[PDB]
């Protein structure tokens, strides 16, 4: 049951659970830092929130280098 | 008024019972603690007045704030004051405690101890020589002698 789109869907509804994002707006090259107007503060909030959700630690240089939800899904498929 | 007569005599009896012993707790931070120990000395008794030095805040009648009260200390002081049985009375001993004193114009010193607890008897001196503290405890006992608690409970 290690499905990639299941990881995509669970990332999508926990980003929905994050209440300071408008709209959800799932993309492959979304870049929610500048194309959605967020700080690196909220970036690291989302990254360790994924850490809170489904497992491994996802270290801080990688938190500096994800920038995008589809790339988070690809990073999870790389790591998990 | 035989009922008022009974209430007056019984109030006199229970206020005598309250002012009888009055075992304190010795809080005692700085050199005022040494002077509290020196009115616990064999020359100036405390047991003659029913007073016994005791480290039990769960049963202490009055609380003697003595020493320099600081910001790192004052939550612990009031947390001691809050687990104290509700008939409670306060003697502020010493220049540091009764209005700030020598370390007044200073950070991390609470300017007095009215900013923490209410105060019944101020006894100044630095240190207040034990005769003056003992006279202050006598005036506290006479404050307990003037309470009219049960009379107010009657005519309330």
């Amino acid at each position: 049951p290690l499905t990639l789109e299941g990881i995509k869907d669970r990332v999508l509804y926990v980003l929905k659970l994050y209440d300071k994002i408008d709209p959800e707006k799932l993309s492959v090259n979304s870049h929610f830092m500048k194309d959605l107007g967020l700080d690196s503060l909220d970036q690291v909030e989302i990254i360790m929130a994924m850490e809170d959700e489904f497992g491994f630690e996802i270290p801080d240089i990688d938190a500096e280098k994800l920038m995008c939800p589809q790339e988070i899904v690809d990073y999870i498929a790389d790591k998990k | 008024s035989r009922g008022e007569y009974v209430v007056a005599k019984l109030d006199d009896l229970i206020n005598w019972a309250r002012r009888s012993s009055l075992w304190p707790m010795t809080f005692g931070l700085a050199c005022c603690a040494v002077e509290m120990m020196h009115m616990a000395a064999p020359r100036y008794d405390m047991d003659r007045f029913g007073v016994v030095f005791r480290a039990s805040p769960r049963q202490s009648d009055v609380m003697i704030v003595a020493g320099t009260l600081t910001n790192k200390m004052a939550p612990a002081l009031r947390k001691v004051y809050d687990q104290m049985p509700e008939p409670r009375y306060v003697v502020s001993m010493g220049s540091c405690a009764n209005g700030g004193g020598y370390y007044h114009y200073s950070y991390s010193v609470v300017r007095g101890c009215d900013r923490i607890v209410p105060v019944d008897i101020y006894v100044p001196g630095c240190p207040p020589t034990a005769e003056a503290l003992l006279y202050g405890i006598l005036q506290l006992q006479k404050k307990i002698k003037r309470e009219k608690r049960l009379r107010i409970w009657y005519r309330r």
């Binding site: - | 910001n71 790192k72 004052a74 939550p75 009031r78 114009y105 200073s106 950070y107 991390s108 609470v110 300017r111 900013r115 923490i116 607890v117």
Partner: protein
Amino acid sequence: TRPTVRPRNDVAHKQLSAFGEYVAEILPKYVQQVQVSCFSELEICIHPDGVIPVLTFLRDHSNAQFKSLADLTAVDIPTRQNRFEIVYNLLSLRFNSRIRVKTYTDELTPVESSVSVYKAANWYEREIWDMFGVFFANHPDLRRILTDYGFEGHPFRKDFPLSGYVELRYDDEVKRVVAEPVELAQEFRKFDLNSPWEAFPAYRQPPE
């Protein structure tokens, strides 16, 4: 002169002069000043790099024992580019002499954590970190001693005023003790006492 004036012993003056000249000529890498007072207690004025080699040299070497460490205070002086002064104080058990190791330091660049060579400097470094802001590099535990926890401001500075910025009081609304900005009950008159007319002619610094 002969009554009412403490005399000085020029034997100890010559001895401490020769010893300080010896130490200065055998550690050229970090020495700037070796000054001798009138009352013959040595002062050695040091760049903030060789703290650990000078202390390891002054704990041992058998020409000067100085096993005993005392205080460290970094007394805050403005109108200096490097402000603070670390004052180690060293006492010999065998020799009965006192040397004040003054190394200078700035606001930010650390001195090198003398707790590794003298175990008595642990709370000294922690305390001077709390009160000043002199950081110590590769020290085990750096916490706040002699202040409140939520307090900050490094109060033994000269920029921190005499009365603090906080003032505690209990209140019954929120049922606890809270801090408000400071409200004095009296002004604390800081009097003018610097009188003119130059009471010490021997300390007239050369003007501009």
